[PDB]
């Protein structure tokens, strides 16, 4: 039965060094400015069956005044206030739609095609208390709400869906993609498998290249999620690009996950989703949730310093 497709929320991870790195930026250079700063976030595929990956802010995240296998760079913006009260008086919805609009623009301009790493664009609003040395922050991962919500038709473990030969050939291709520095941190791709059961991974722009035989094509992505019944958050804006560019009614997607540092297809998932078909920017959702609720996160680093 064709059910409504639910995406698992992306969770954040701020490494300690990010704050230390920022506390220096704020004190030595910025001053009173509450002006936004563009930052770099990092994520990757799922690395273990029990635990899903995160969007991680490190000290490399802040401007250098990057991106390996385990760090796929994603563009973001930071809004840090000077007081508690100005932090609370932040217009969450105008800031979320401001960032979500940037994504939609890249989807429209053909930018997301050239560089799909722009899709998981994220927002951070914070308040750095440089007196007490405690930090208040809130992450946002804008994802568009498609007017009629995407309908899930099936979602199998990738190793079920693929044969044995296909499995071998896919993971051989997947590992090659992860193994070469030019493609390692490109978190969105096409997986095509020939009728001969030979698999190859091509860039999103090469879609037209990829229509040729009686060959399956799958819209793959680094899935940060570990859950065996839901795809990760990055599928949202990914499916938005697919509809906005090629207007597909039926889409096969590949939730790429790994274990022990290499492609794992029992963990990975193949699914097919269904989308209905002048239009503007849809609605956006997604402010990360704390132990369950719409609440910001706080960390006191007074002991580390």
């Amino acid at each position: 039965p064709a059910i409504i497709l639910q995406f698992a929320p992306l969770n954040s991870s701020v490494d300690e060094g990010f704050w230390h790195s920022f506390s220096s930026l704020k004190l030595d250079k910025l001053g009173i400015d509450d002006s936004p700063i563009s930052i770099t976030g990092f994520y990757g595929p799922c690395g273990h069956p029990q635990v899903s990956n995160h969007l991680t802010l490190l000290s490399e995240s802040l401007p250098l005044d990057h991106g390996n296998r385990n760090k796929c760079p994603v563009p973001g913006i930071l809004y840090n206030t000077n007081t508690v009260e100005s932090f609370n008086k932040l217009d969450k919805q105008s800031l979320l739609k401001a960032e979500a609009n940037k994504i939609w623009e890249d989807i429209q301009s053909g930018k997301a095609l050239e560089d799909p790493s722009v899709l998981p664009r994220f927002l951070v609003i914070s308040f750095a208390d440089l007196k007490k040395w405690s930090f208040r922050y809130w992450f946002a991962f804008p994802a568009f709400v498609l007017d009629p919500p995407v309908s899930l038709i099936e979602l199998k473990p990738a190793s079920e869906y693929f044969s044995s030969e296909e499995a071998e050939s896919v993971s051989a291709a997947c590992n090659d993609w992860r193994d070469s520095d030019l493609t390692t941190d490109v978190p969105f791709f096409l997986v095509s498998v020939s009728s001969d059961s030979k698999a190859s991974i091509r860039h999103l722009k090469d879609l037209e290249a990829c229509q040729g035989d009686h060959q399956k094509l799958l819209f793959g992505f680094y899935d940060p999620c570990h859950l065996p019944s839901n795809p990760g958050w990055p599928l949202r804006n990914y499916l938005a690009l697919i509809r906005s560019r090629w207007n597909l009614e039926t889409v096969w997607f590949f939730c790429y996950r790994e274990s022990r540092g290499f492609a794992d297809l029992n963990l990975s998932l193949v699914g097919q989703a269904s989308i209905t078909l002048a239009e503007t920017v849809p609605n956006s959702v997604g402010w990360e949730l704390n132990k369950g609720k719409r609440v910001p996160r706080s960390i006191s680093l007074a002991n580390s310093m």
Binding site: S13, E16, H20, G47, N53, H54, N70, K71, N303
Partner: protein, 175 residues
């Protein structure tokens, strides 16, 4: 040297980069890091200062029920000529754990809090002073079994032994 490895259980800087390269190759969950530019060690390649692996699950405490994740690095202790393991624990909702709570994931079968040689903040760490002797024993045992391990595998041996110190932290190593 290969004699220093067998007789002392030690590791030279070049051999450390060698073994570390091999760890990354076999277990791509591990990555090389540069760390803080001000904390760079001139005797190690700038892009290869220490090894780290992120988001490593720990589903239960060492005493053999709530899930914690770890970031754990391997630095090179120039004095002991051995690697050193540094761990950073995290909450069930990925918030930084207090360093003394990590002792619960250390096997009660010596660990200490200190500053990282490349990073900010205080990290729990297994002290390396005994690692040399430990490695010498493991080398001895393997040698007579017929297995003659070379220094490019130090870390794989090192991490298998470390599993007895932190049994519930699920990092990668192959044999």
């Amino acid at each position: 040297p290969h004699m220093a490895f067998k007789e002392k259980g030690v590791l030279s800087v070049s051999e450390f980069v060698l073994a570390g390269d091999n760890l990354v190759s076999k277990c791509p969950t591990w990555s090389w890091e540069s760390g803080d530019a001000s904390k760079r060690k001139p005797y190690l390649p700038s892009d290869k200062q220490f090894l780290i692996t992120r988001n490593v699950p720990c589903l239960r405490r060492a005493a053999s029920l709530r899930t914690r994740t770890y970031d754990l690095s391997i630095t090179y202790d120039k004095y002991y000529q051995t690697p050193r393991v540094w761990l950073t624990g995290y909450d069930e909702s990925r918030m930084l754990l207090q360093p003394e709570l990590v002792m619960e994931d250390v096997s009660q079968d010596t660990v200490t809090i200190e500053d990282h040689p490349h990073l900010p903040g205080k990290h729990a760490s297994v002290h390396p002073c005994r690692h040399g002797a430990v490695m010498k024993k493991i080398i001895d045992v393997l040698m007579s079994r017929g297995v003659e391990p070379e220094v490019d595998k130090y870390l794989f041996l090192f991490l298998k032994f470390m599993a007895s110190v932190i049994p519930t932290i699920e990092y990668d190593y192959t044999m």
